[PDB]
Amino acid sequence: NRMKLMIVGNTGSGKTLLQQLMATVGIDVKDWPVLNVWDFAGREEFYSTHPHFMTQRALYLAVYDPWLFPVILVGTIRDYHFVRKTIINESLAVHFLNESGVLLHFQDPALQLSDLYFVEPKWLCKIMAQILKGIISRRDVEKFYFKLLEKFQIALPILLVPSSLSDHRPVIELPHCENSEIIIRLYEMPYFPMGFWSRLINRLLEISPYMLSALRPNRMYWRQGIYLNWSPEAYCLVGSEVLPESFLKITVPSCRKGCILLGQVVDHIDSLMEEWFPGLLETLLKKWALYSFNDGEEHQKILLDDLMKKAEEGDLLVNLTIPISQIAPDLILADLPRNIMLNNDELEFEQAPEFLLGDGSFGSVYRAAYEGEEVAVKIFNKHTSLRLLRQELVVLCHLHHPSLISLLAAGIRPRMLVMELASKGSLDRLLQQDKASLTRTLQHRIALHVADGLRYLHSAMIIYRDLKPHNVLLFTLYPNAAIIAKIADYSIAQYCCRMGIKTSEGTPGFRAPEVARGNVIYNQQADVYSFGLLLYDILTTGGRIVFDELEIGKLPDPVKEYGCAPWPMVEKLIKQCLKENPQERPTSAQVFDILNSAELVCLTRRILLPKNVIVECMVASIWLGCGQLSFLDLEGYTSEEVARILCLALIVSGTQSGTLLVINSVTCLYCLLVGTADGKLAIFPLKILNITPLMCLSESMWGGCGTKIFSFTIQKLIETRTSQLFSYAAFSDNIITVVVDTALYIAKQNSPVVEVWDKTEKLCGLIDCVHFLYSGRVKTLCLQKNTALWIGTGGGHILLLDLSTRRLIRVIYNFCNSVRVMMTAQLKNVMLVLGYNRIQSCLTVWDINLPHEVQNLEKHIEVRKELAEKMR
Amino acid sequence: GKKLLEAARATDEAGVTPLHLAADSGHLEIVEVLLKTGADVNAWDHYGFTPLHLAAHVGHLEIVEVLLKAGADVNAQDHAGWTPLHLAALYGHLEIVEVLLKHGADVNAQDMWGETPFDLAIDNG
Ligand SMILES: C[C@@H]1CN(c2cc(-c3n[nH]c4ccc(OC5(C)CC5)cc34)ncn2)C[C@H](C)O1
Ligand SMILES: Nc1nc2c(ncn2[C@@H]2O[C@H](COP(=O)(O)OP(=O)(O)O)[C@@H](O)[C@H]2O)c(=O)[nH]1
């Protein structure tokens, strides 16, 4: 049984007391039998990092000649003493070791150090303090690790080192010194929490480029203030002042840009206090507004709550009269872009249950009309505040994306927040009710748009935290539309800078495992698990929705449990999104990149055959080859020896011996046609058309025996060796496949060139499969009706070339290692691709609309990109 | 201008040198006069082949000897990771196989699929 014992107090108090119990830098950690003491430093420079080393198991001694934000007080509150028996009397796997004090470790994803355990915690406390006119560069302290320096609010990257800065405030003579020219906001606290000014300064020099617009202002710091300066008409002076209490003073010009800056600064200060110092808001903190009726007297102060009550009715302050928009332009939304401003005469709504659209845990969304068009209005509940509306407007303003809901006008009198109306409702209703309209294209588009919205939100330094099908709204069910799905309900959306987020919010069953822990400082990666859950729901339609315990993740496979059609590259994405480690999950941009591919959409099946099985041919239930014969049910494998086997045609088989059999050296069977290695062409024995090895046959009658093309009774013996003038004679001199639509597309043994011949019996062009592209040698050729030519190369690449312009549509990535045989079958027209992995046989089923889907997806992405550009 | 490539047939977009065409077409005199001119015997095109590769592919052992006396690379890997041994054993060129292994040929070269020259010699007689 051991526990810590903190000895805290001001500098010079005597913490000369611990030694008898048996100026320090950082924290002194010793042992005292059992109790491991933690002697803190009373000098102000370490106060910022002092809170990071305070726990509940300890036995804090307050030594006096802030900290309190089993404590006993000793002079040099469960007890009081003046100066060992009292301490003993009053004192009566990896995570548990941290509390004891054997070693320190932080499992929170924000610090990004969950894979580094350091023993001897006393070393870290000393090292965090040896670095401390406070300003230094990286090379200055390298000669006397930098991931901990910025993660403890000790050396911010600009390195500021907010501590040890000049305590003396300079003589800052602002412009617009008159009362009617500046707005002053006062925060009064009994004391400044430790690290409060460091955290505030760090937050303020991270939004400065975006506080007005991206333009950087001029900045000054004195460890208890910061002056941001864009122009004489756009500045902000946030600093500490005195009058027995602690005052935080904010000064801005009394103009449009000044009001905008004041709104941004108060919003960020409020969010900072909510996230990191909730004790002040439990009230200890008083907020005042400074006003003067004339421009000749001292300022008078009114509490922000009284001013809010007065602004609830009318926008004027009476004694002499001042408009509230120049005292507190943040209570009434005067700092807002002013294009989204309510026009209550132009709004008609009734707030009835039949017009209800949903709920948002802080207000109800209703159907309404605003400016003569159908809209959605989120009436805020009577137990709410202006803070909730302002932090929703934080995202609903300044952020415009095609995948994010659009705001039109906002009010304060009813706190209304008029938005745009989704034409088709939410995705939850579609999943639970309209199960037949969810085509694969619509599912992919919904996923793509949600991923795009998440990516933009994350890029805008915002975490969503509530991603469910209820928050996804559908504007159309037509798959070829630019806007289909959007994201709404930003009630719990909060700023997420490079400091993490502590409060745990989110609907159970739709949140990442770390958030549900409730004691971790997480980041924007918590939304990736929510997106993975949403993708699982879309793939399974109703699924698990129609809970929380097994998603924090023990989810089954989507296909077997709910009987949904297989969706390869979507199940894989779900698996890598549903990772217990946030660092292993892809980002939102990476998720959008993974989803943005037509190979994901058009890959219908992927069947893995047993290992060490080699396939030579296949026909469509799909009969397989290998003397040995196989069969597959498009899954089930049945194999037995019957004779190798070279060609199949239904079921007639062909072996490399001259024996053909039917089950209820031949090289080509077509439908009956027989092609041997000598040149003979049998008919099924009606006749023989003996002509070295005949391996090709096509009709759209065409074929090829050796290096020559025939037709049939042989019509046109088109000799094709005479092409060495173009490409190598090695390539020019046997034909692998013959494909004809209007010309003769010919592939040859180990030849990366697909010859084109006219059916004038002359060459019309060469197709280089290595120019488009790793072995580019052609193995298979396939034709799609007036759409494209499918080329299976020696590697795992499939080239889609337009039949008209010979242009490349797409090179299908290496799904497997070598395309063996490719054909089109009737499963829904599909293309059957047989590949290798050298030896693992590899069968893949592709939708026949792969080129069209590639073109549609690229056009869709370009259209959405132009829409996103036009939004801003 | 690039009007010499056709002469050897009877660089470029692919990157074909007239020495490549001379070796492939079966012309030994053009190869001999090109070596005297000071051409490149280890020049790779888009396909990744070298004059020895084409010479082994067609099956002209005399051209193989001429390019092996000029100081070529006996074991060179194309885009598919193939060496002249694979091309010589794939088309049944026993004399070229014997000639190649006398200048330091790697008989255990693994292509991008993992096959050795013996594999291609056994899978195609
Ligand atoms: C079926 C019916 C339902 N409908 C809707 C619309 C909406 C909706 N629209 N705009 C919104 C903006 C915000 C919003 O915040 C949510 C996500 C908190 C509910 C909902 C909507 N949400 C459900 N249903 C639209 C009509 C035509 O169709
Ligand atoms: N005369 C006198 N000096 C004291 C007494 N208690 C503490 N001190 C002095 O106060 C200093 C204590 O420093 P300390 O608190 O350990 O530094 P800190 O840990 O950085 O706050 C010592 O140097 C002592 O000389 C006392 O009772 N009498």
Residue numbers in the entry:
A (entry chain A): 1333 to 1347, 1349 to 1355, 1367 to 1377, 1389 to 1420, 1433 to 1436, 1446 to 1452, 1482 to 1488, 1501 to 1509, ...
B (entry chain B): 17 to 26, 45 to 159
Sentences from the paper on this structure:
Mutations in leucine-rich repeat kinase 2 (LRRK2) are one of the most common drivers of the familial form of Parkinson’s disease (PD) (1–3) and are also associated with increased risk for the sporadic form of PD. LRRK2 is a large, 2527-residue multidomain protein. Its N-terminal half is composed of armadillo (ARM), ankyrin (ANK), and leucine-rich (LRR) repeat domains, while its C-terminal half contains two catalytic domains, a guanosine triphosphatase (GTPase) (Ras of complex or ROC) and a Ser/Thr kinase, as well as two architectural domains, a C-terminal of ROC (COR) between the GTPase and the kinase and a WD40 domain at the end. We present cryo-EM structures of LRRK2RCKW, WT, and carrying the PD-linked mutations G2019S and I2020T, bound to the LRRK2-specific type I inhibitor MLi-2 or the broad-spectrum type II inhibitor GZD-824.
G2019S is the most frequently identified LRRK2 mutation in patients with PD. MLi-2 bound as expected in the adenosine 5′-triphosphate (ATP)–binding pocket of LRRK2’s kinase, with its indazole group making hydrogen bonds with the backbones of E1948 and A1950 in the kinase hinge region, as recently proposed based on molecular dynamics simulations. In contrast to those simulations, however, the glycine-rich (G) loop was extended in our structure, as expected for an active kinase domain, and F1890, located at the tip of the G-loop, was not involved in coordinating MLi-2. Also as expected, MLi-2 binding stabilized the DYG “in” and αC “in” conformation, a fully formed R-spine, and an ordered activation loop. Although the three structures—WT, G2019S, and I2020T—were very similar, two features were unique to LRRK2RCKW(G2019S):MLi-2. First, the presence of a Ser instead of a Gly at position 2019 introduced a clash with the G-loop that pushed S1889 away from S2019. The second was an unexplained density we observed in the LRRK2RCKW(WT):MLi-2 and LRRK2RCKW(I2020T):MLi-2 cryo-EM maps, but not in that of LRRK2RCKW(G2019S):MLi-2. Given the absence of density for this rotamer in G2019S, we predicted weaker binding of MLi-2 to LRRK2’s kinase carrying the G2019S mutation. Although the accurate determination of sub-nanomolar inhibitor affinities for complex proteins is challenging, our DSF assay showed that the addition of MLi-2 to LRRK2KW(G2019S) resulted in less thermal stabilization than that observed with LRRK2KW(WT). Our results raise the possibility that IC50’s measured using full-length LRRK2 (in vitro, in cells, or in vivo) may be a combination of IC50’s for at least two different populations: One population corresponds to the autoinhibited LRRK2, where the kinase cannot reach its fully active-like state, represented by our LRRK2(I2020T):MLi-2 structure, while the other population corresponds to activated LRRK2, where the repeats have undocked and the kinase can reach its active-like state, represented by our LRRK2RCKW(G2019S):MLi-2 structure.
